[PDB]
Coordinates of C-alpha atoms in Angstrom, one line a residue:
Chain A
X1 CA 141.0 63.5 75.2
X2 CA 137.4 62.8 73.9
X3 CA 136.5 62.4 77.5
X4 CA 137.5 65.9 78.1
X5 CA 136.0 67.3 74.8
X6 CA 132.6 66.0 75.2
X7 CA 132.8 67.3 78.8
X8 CA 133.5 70.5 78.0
X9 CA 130.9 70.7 75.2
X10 CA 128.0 69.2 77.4
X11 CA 129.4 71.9 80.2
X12 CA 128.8 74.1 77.7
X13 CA 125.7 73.1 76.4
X14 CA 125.2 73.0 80.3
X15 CA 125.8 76.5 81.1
X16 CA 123.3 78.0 78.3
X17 CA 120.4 75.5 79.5
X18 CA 121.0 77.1 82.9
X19 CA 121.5 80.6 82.1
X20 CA 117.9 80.5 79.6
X21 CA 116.2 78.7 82.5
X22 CA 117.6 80.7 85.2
X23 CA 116.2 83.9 83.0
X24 CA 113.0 82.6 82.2
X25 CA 111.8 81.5 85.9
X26 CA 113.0 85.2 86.6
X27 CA 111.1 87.3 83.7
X28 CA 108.1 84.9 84.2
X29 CA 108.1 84.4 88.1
X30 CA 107.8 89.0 89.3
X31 CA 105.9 90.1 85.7
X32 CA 102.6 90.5 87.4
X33 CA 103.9 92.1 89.8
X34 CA 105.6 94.8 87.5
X35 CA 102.9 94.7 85.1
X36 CA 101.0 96.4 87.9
X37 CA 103.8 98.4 89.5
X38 CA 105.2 100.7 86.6
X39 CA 103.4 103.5 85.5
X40 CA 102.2 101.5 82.9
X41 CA 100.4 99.6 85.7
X42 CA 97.3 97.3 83.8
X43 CA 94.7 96.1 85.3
X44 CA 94.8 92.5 87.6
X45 CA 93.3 89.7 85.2
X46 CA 94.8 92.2 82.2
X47 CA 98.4 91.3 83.9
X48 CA 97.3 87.7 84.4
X49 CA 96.0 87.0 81.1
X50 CA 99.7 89.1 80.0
X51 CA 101.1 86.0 81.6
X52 CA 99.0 83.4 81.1
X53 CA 99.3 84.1 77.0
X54 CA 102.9 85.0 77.6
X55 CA 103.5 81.0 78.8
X56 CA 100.8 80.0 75.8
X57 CA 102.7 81.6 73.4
X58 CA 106.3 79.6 74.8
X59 CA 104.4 76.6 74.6
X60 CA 102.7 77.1 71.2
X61 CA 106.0 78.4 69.6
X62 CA 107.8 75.2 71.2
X63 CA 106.6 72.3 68.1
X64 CA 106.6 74.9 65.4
X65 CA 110.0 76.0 66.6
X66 CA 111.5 72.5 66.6
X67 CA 109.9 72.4 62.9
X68 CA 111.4 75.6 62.1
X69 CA 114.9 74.2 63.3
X70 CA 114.7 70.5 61.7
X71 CA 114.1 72.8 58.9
X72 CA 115.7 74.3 56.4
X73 CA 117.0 76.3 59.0
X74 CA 120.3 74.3 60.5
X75 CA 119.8 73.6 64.6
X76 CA 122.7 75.6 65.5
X77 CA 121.8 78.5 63.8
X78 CA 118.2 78.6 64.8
X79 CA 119.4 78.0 68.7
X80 CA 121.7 81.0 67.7
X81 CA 118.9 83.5 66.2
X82 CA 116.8 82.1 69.3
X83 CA 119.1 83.3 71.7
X84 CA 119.8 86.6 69.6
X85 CA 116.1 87.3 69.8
X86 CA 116.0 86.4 73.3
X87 CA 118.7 88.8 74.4
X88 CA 117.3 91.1 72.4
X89 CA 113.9 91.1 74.7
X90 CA 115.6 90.4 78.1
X91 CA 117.5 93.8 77.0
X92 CA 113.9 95.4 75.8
X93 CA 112.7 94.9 79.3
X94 CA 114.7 96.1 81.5
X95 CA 114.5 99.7 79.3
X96 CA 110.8 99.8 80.0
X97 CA 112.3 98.7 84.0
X98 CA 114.5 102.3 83.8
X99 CA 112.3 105.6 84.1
X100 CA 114.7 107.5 81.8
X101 CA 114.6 104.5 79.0
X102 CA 110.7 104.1 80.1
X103 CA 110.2 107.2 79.2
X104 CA 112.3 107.6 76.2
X105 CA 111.5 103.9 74.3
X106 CA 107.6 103.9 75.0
X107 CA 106.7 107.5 74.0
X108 CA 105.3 110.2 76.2
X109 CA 101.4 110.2 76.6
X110 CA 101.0 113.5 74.5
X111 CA 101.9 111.6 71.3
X112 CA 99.6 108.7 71.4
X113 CA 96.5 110.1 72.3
X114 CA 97.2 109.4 76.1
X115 CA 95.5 112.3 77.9
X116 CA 92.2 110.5 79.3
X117 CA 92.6 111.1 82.8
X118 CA 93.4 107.7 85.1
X119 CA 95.9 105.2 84.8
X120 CA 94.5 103.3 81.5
X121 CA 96.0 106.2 79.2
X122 CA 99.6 105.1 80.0
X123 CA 98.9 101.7 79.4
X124 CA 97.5 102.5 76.2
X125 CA 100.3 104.2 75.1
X126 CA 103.4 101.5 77.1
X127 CA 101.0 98.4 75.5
X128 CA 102.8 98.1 72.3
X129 CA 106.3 97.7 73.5
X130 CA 105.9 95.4 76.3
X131 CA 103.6 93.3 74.2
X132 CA 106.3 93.6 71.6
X133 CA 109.3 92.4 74.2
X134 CA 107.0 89.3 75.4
X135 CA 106.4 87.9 72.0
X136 CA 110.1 88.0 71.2
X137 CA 110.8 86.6 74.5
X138 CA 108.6 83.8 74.0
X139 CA 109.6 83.0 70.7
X140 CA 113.1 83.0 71.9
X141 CA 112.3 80.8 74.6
X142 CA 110.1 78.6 72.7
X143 CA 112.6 77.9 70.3
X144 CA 115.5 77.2 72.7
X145 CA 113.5 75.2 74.8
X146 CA 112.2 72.8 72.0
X147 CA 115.9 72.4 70.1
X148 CA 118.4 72.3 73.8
X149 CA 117.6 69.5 74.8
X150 CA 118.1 67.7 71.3
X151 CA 121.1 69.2 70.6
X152 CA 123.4 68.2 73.6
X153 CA 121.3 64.7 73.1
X154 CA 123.2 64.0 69.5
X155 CA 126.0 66.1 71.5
X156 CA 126.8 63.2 73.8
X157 CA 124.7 60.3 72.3
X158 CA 127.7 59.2 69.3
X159 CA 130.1 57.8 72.1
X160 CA 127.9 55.6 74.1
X161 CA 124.0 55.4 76.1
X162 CA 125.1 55.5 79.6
X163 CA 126.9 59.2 78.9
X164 CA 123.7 59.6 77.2
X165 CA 122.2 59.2 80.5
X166 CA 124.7 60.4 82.7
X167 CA 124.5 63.7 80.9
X168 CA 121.2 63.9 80.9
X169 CA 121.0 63.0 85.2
X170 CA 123.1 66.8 85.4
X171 CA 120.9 68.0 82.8
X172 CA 118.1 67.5 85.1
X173 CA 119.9 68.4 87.9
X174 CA 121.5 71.7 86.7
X175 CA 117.9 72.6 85.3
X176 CA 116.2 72.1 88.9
X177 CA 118.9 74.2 90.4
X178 CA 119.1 76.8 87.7
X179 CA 115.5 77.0 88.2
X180 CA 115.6 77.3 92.4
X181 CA 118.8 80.1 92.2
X182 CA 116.9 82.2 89.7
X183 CA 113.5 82.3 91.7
X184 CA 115.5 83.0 95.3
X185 CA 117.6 85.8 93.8
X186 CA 116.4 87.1 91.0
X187 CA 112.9 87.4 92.7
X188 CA 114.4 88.9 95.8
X189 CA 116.0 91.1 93.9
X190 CA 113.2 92.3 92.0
X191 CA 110.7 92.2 94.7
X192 CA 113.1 94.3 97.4
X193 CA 115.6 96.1 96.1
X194 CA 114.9 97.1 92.1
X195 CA 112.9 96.1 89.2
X196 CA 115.7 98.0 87.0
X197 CA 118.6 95.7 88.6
X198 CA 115.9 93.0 89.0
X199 CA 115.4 92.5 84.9
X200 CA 119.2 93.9 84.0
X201 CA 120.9 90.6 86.0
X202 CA 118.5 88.3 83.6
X203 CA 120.0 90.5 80.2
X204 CA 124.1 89.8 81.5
X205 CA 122.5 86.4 82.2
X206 CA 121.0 86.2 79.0
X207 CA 124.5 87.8 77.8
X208 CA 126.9 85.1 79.2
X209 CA 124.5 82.3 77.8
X210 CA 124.3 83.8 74.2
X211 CA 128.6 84.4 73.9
X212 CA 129.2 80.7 76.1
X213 CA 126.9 79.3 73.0
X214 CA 128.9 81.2 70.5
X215 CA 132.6 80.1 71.0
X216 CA 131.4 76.8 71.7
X217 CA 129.9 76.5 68.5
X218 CA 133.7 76.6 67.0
X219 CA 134.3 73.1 69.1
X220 CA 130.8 72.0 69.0
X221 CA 129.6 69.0 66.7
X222 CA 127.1 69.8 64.3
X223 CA 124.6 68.0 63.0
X224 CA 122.8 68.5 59.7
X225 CA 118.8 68.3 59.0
X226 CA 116.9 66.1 58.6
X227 CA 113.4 66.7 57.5
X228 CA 111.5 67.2 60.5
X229 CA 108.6 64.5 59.8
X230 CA 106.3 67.4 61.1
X231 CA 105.7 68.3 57.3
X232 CA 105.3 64.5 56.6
X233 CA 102.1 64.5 59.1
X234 CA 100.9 68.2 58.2
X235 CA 101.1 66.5 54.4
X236 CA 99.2 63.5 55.4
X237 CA 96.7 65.6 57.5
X238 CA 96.0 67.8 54.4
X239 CA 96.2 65.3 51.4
X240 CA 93.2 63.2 53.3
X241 CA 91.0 66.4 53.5
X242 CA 104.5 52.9 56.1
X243 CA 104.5 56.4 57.8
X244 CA 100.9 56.5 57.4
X245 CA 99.5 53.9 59.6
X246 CA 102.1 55.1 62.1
X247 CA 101.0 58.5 62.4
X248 CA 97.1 57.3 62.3
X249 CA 98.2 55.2 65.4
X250 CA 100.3 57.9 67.5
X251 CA 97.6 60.8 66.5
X252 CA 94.7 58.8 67.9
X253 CA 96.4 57.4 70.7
X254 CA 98.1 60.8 71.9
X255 CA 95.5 63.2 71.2
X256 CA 92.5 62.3 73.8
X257 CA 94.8 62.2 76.6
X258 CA 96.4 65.4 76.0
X259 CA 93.0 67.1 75.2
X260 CA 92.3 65.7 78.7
X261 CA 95.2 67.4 80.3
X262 CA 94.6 70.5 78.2
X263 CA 92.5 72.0 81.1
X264 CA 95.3 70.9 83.2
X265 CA 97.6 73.1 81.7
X266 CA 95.1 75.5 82.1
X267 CA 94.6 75.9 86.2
X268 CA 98.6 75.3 86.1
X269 CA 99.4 78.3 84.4
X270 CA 96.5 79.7 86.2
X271 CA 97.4 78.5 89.3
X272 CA 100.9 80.4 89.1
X273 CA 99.3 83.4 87.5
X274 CA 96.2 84.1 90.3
X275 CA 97.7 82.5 93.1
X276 CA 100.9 85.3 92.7
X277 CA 98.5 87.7 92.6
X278 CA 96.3 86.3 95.3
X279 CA 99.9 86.0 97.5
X280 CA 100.2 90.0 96.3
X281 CA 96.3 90.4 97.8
X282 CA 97.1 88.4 101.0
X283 CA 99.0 89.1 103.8
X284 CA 102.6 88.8 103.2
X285 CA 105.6 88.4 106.1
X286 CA 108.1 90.9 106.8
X287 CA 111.6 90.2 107.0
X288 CA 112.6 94.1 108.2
X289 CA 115.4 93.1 111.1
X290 CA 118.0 95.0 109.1
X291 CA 115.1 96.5 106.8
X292 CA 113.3 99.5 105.9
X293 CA 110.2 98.9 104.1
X294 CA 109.8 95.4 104.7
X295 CA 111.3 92.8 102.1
X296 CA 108.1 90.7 101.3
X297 CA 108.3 86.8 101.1
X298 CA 108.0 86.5 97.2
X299 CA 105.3 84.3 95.8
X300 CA 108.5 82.9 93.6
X301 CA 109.5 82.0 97.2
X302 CA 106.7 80.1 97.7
X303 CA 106.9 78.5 93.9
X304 CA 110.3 77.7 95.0
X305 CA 109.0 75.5 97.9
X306 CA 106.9 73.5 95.3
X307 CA 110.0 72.9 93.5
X308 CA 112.3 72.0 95.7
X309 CA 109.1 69.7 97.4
X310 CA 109.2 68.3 93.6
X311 CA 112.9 67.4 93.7
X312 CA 112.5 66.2 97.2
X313 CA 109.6 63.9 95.9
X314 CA 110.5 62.2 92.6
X315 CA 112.9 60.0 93.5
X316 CA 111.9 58.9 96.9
X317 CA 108.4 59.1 95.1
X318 CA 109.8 56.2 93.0
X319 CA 111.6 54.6 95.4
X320 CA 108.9 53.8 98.2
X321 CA 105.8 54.2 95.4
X322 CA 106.9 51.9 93.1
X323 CA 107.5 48.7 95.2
X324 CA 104.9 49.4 97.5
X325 CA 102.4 50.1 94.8
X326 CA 103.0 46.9 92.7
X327 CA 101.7 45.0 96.1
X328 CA 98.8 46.8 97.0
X329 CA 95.1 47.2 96.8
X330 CA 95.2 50.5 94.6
X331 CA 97.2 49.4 91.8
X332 CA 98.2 52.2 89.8
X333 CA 98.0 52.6 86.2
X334 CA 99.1 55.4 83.7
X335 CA 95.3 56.2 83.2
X336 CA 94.6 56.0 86.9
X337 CA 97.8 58.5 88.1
X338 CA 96.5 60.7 85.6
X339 CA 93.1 60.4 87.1
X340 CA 94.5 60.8 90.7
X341 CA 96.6 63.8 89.6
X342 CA 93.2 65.6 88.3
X343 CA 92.0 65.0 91.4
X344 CA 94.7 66.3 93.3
X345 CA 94.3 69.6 91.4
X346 CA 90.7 69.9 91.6
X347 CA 91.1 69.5 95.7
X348 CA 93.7 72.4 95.4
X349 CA 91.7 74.8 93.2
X350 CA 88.8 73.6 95.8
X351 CA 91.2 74.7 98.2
X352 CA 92.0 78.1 96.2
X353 CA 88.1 79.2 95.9
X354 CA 87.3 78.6 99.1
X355 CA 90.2 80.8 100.2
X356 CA 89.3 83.3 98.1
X357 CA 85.8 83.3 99.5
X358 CA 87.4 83.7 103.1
X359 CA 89.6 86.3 102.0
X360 CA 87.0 88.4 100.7
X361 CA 84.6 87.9 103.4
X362 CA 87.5 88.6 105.9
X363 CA 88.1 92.2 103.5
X364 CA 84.3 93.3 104.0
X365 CA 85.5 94.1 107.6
X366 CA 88.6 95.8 107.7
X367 CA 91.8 96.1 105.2
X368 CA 95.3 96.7 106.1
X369 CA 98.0 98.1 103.9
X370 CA 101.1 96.1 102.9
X371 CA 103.5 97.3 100.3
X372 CA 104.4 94.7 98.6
X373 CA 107.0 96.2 95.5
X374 CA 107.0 100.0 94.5
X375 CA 102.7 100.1 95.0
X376 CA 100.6 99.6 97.9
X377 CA 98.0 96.3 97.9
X378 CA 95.1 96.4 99.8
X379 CA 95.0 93.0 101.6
X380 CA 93.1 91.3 104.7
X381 CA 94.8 90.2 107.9
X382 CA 95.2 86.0 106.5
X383 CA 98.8 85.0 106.0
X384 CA 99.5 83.4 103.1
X385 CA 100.5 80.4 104.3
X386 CA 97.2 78.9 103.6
X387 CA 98.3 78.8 100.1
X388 CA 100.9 76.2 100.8
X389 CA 98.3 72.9 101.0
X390 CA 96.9 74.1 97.6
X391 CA 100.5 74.6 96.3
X392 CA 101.7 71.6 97.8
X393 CA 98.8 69.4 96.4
X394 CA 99.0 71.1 92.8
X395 CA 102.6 69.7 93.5
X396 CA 102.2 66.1 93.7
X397 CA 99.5 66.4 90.8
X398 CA 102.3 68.1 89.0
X399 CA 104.2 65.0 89.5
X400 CA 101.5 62.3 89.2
X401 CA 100.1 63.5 86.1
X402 CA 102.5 65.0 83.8
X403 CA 105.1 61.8 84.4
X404 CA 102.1 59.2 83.5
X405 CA 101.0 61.2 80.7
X406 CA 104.6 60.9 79.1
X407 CA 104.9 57.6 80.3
X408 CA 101.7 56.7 78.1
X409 CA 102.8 59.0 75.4
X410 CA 105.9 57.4 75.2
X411 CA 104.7 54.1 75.7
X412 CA 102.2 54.0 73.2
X413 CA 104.1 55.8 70.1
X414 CA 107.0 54.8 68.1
X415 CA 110.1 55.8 68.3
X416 CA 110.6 58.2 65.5
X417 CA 107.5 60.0 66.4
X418 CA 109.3 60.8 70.0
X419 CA 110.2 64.3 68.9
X420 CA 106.4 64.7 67.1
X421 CA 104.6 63.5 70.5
X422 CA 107.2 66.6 72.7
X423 CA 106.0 68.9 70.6
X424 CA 102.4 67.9 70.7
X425 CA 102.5 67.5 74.2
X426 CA 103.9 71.0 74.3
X427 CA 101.5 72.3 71.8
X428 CA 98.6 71.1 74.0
X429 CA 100.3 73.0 77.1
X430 CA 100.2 75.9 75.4
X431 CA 96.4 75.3 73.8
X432 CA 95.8 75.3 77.4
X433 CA 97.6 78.4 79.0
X434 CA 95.6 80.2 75.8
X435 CA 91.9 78.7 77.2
X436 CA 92.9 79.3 80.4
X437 CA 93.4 83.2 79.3
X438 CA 89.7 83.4 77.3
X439 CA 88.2 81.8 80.1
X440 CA 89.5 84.7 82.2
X441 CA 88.6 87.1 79.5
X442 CA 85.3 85.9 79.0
X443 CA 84.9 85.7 83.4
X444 CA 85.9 89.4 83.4
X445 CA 83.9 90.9 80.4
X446 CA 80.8 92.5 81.1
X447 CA 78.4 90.5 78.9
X448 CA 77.8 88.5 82.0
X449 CA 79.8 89.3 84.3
X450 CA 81.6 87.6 87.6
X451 CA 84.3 90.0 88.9
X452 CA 84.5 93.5 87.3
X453 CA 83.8 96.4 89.5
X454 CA 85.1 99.0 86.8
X455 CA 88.2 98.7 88.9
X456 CA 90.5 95.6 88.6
X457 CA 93.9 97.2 89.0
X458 CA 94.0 97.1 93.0
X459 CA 90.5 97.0 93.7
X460 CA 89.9 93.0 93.6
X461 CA 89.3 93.0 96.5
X462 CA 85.6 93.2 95.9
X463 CA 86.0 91.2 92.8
X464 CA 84.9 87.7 92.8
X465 CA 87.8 85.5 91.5
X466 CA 87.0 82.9 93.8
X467 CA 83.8 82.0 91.2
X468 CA 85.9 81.8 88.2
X469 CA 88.1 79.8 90.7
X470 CA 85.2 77.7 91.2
X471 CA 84.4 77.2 87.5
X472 CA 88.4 76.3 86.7
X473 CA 87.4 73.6 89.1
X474 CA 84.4 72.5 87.9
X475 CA 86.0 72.1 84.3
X476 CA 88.8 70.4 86.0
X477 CA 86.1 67.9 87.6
X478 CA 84.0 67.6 84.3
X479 CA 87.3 66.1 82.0
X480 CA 88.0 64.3 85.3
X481 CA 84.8 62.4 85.2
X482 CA 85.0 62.4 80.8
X483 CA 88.3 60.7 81.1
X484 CA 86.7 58.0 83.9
X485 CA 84.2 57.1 81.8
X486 CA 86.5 56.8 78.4
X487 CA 88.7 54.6 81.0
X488 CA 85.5 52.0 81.9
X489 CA 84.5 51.5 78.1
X490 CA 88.2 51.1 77.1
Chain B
X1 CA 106.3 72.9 83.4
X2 CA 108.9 72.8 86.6
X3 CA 109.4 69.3 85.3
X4 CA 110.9 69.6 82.1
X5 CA 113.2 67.7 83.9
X6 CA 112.5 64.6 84.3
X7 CA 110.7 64.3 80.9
X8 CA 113.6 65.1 78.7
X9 CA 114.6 62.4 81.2
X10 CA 112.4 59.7 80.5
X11 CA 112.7 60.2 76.7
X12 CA 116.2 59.1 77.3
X13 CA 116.6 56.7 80.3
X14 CA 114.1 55.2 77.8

C-alpha cells in the first residue's frame, strides 16, 4: 500500500529528473557545434561564450529559483511553470533546427537590416531568438534543477531516513545514467544524422517529463511554503548597511572557499566549452564501415568517458582512498583535496595550452579537411585522443574538489542553512561560468588582443587560444597558491 | 556539474 505509493511517486519524480537531465546534457553537450553550423553560424569564442553564459545563467538562476519557489510561489507549481517554460524552449530550438521554421520564426535578412555581405548579417538578424530560447531554457533548468531534488526529498523523507537514502542511491544512479544515454544518443544523433531530429527527441523528451509531472501531481504530496530564509539573510545583509550569528558564521565560513573555487567553475565550464571546440579543430575518427560521410566520434563521446571514469571512480575512490589514506604520509584534509584538485586542473589546462600550441604549430604546415556536422573544420593531422589525459585529470579534480568543498560546506554550516549553502554554492558556479565568459571576451577584443584574426568562425586555426589557455591556468595557479597561504595562517 | 550526484547525496546520507 504506502510501499507501492511512495514508489510510484519517487518513480515518478524519477522519470522527470531523468528526462530534464537527459535534455539538458543533449541541448548543452552539440550547441557549439550548431551555433556554428546553421546559417546563423557565429563566430568560435561568440559560440563559446553562447555556452559558457548559457551554464552561468543555469547556475545563477538556480538560488534565486529555489527563492522564487520557497516563495510565495507553491513548489509544485513553480516546478510546473519551470517545466512549461522549459518545453517551451526545447520546442523554440528545434524551429530554429528546421530550414522552413528557421526561416519563418527568425525573419528573412531583408527585414532586419541584414544585407552586409558575409555571414555576420544572418547572425545579426537569427541573435534574438536563439538568445531568446537560451534564457528560457536556462531559467527552466535553473529552476527545476534547484526545487527536484527537494521535492522528492520531503516526497520520501515522512516514512523513514533509510528510504530517504535508498531513494536518493537511484536518484544518483538514474541521474548518472540519464546523463550517459542522453550524451551517446542524443549527440550521435545530432552530430550524424540531423540537428532537426537531434533537438526534436529532447522536445518529446521534454514532453513526456512535463505530462509524467502533471498526472502525478494528482497523487503527489504537496507541501506548503515556508519562507525561504533567503529573504531572512538578504534582510540581515541590508538592514546592517538567533538567526543572526548563524548566518554571520555560515557567510564567512562558506564564502572564501567558494570564491576560491569560483575560477574552478570557470576553466570547468571552459574546459567543456573550448575543449568541444578544440575536438571540432582536431582530428576526429571515422566510423564510415556502413557510412557515407563519416559519423565523427563526438566530443559528448569523449565527456561521456569522463563520466562514466567518474562513476567508475567514486566509490572505489572511497573504498581504497579512505582506509589507505587515514594510514599514510599524505593525510588528506578537506582544505588539502581541494588544493590537490586545483592542482589537478591546472596540470590539465597545462596539458590543454600546450596542446594547443602543438596543434597550431603542426597547422603552419599543412591542413586537412574533416567534416565534422553539416560545415567543414579545417584541422591538423593530431588525433584527439591527446585530449583524454587533460579530460581524465580534470576528472579526478572534478571529484576531489567539488566532494571536499561540500564536505566543508556542509560540515561547517548548520543545518537549516543546508538549502542557503546549495544555492550559494550554485550561485558561485555560475559567478564563475560568467568570469570565465568576460575573460574570453576581454582575450578576444581588440583593445589588446591575443587571438582575433578578423576571422574567428573557422579560421582559429591561426588564433592563439592556447595563451588565454595559458592565462585560465595561471589564474587557476594564483588562487591555488592564495588558498595555500590562507591554509598556513589558519 | 556531472556530480550533482553525489552532492544531493551527501546532503542526505548526511
Amino acid at each position: 500500500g504506502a510501499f507501492a505509493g511512495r514508489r510510484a511517486a519517487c518513480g515518478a519524480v524519477l522519470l522527470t529528473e531523468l528526462l530534464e537531465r537527459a535534455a539538458f546534457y543533449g541541448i548543452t553537450s552539440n550547441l557549439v557545434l550548431f551555433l556554428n553550423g546553421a546559417p546563423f553560424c557565429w563566430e568560435g569564442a561568440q559560440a563559446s561564450e553562447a555556452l559558457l553564459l548559457f551554464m552561468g545563467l543555469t547556475y545563477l538562476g538556480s538560488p534565486f529559483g529555489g527563492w522564487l519557489a520557497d516563495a510565495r510561489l507553491g513548489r509544485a507549481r513553480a516546478i510546473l511553470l519551470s517545466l512549461a517554460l522549459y518545453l517551451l524552449g526545447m520546442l523554440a530550438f528545434p524551429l530554429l533546427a528546421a530550414p522552413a521554421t528557421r526561416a519563418a520564426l527568425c525573419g528573412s535578412a531583408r527585414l532586419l537590416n541584414c544585407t552586409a555581405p558575409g555571414p555576420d548579417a544572418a547572425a545579426r538578424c537569427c541573435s534574438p531568438a536563439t538568445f531568446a530560447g537560451l534564457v528560457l531554457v536556462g531559467l527552466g533548468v535553473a529552476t527545476v534543477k534547484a526545487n527536484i531534488t527537494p521535492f522528492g526529498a520531503d516526497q520520501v523523507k515522512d516514512r523513514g531516513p533509510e528510504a530517504t537514502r535508498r531513494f536518493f542511491n537511484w536518484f544518483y544512479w538514474s541521474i548518472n545514467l540519464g546523463a550517459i544515454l542522453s550524451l551517446g544518443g542524443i549527440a550521435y544523433i545530432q552530430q550524424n544524422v540531423s540537428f532537426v531530429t537531434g533537438y526534436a527527441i529532447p522536445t518529446v523528451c521534454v514532453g513526456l517529463a512535463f505530462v509524467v509531472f502533471l498526472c502525478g501531481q494528482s497523487v503527489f504530496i504537496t507541501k506548503p511554503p515556508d519562507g525561504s530564509a533567503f529573504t531572512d539573510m538578504f534582510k540581515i545583509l541590508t538592514y546592517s548597511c538567533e538567526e543572526k550569528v548563524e548566518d554571520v558564521k555560515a557567510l564567512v565560513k562558506i564564502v572564501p572557499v567558494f570564491l576560491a573555487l569560483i575560477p574552478y567553475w570557470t576553466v570547468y565550464f571552459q574546459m567543456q566549452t573550448t575543449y568541444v571546440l578544440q575536438s571540432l579543430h582536431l582530428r576526429i575518427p571515422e566510423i564510415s564501415n556502413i557510412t557515407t560521410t563519416p559519423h565523427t566520434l563526438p566530443a559528448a563521446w569523449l565527456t561521456m568517458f569522463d563520466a562514466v571514469l567518474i562513476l567508475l571512480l567514486i566509490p572505489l575512490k572511497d573504498k581504497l582512498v579512505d582506509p589507505i589514506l587515514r594510514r599514510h604520509g599524505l593525510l588528506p584534509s578537506s582544505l588539502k583535496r581541494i588544493a590537490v584538485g586545483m592542482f589537478f586542473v591546472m596540470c590539465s589546462a597545462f596539458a590543454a595550452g600546450i596542446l594547443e600550441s602543438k596543434r597550431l604549430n603542426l597547422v603552419k604546415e599543412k591542413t586537412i579537411n574533416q567534416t565534422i556536422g553539416n560545415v567543414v573544420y579545417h584541422a591538423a593531422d593530431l588525433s584527439l585522443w591527446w585530449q583524454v589525459p587533460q579530460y581524465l585529470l580534470i576528472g579526478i579534480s572534478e571529484i576531489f574538489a567539488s566532494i571536499a568543498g561540500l564536505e566543508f560546506a556542509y560540515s561547517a554550516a548548520p543545518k537549516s542553512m543546508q538549502s542557503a549553502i546549495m544555492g550559494l554554492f550554485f550561485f558561485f558556479s555560475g559567478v564563475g561560468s560568467f568570469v570565465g565568459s568576460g575573460l574570453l571576451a576581454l582575450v578576444s577584443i581588440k583593445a589588446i588582443g591575443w587571438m582575433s584574426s578578423h576571422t574567428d568562425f573557422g579560421n582559429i586555426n591561426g588564433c592563439y587560444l592556447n595563451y588565454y589557455f595559458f592565462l585560465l591556468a595561471a589564474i587557476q595557479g594564483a588562487t591555488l597558491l592564495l588558498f595555500l597561504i590562507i591554509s598556513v595562517k589558519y | 556539474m556531472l556530480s550533482e550526484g553525489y552532492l544531493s547525496g551527501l546532503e542526505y546520507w548526511n
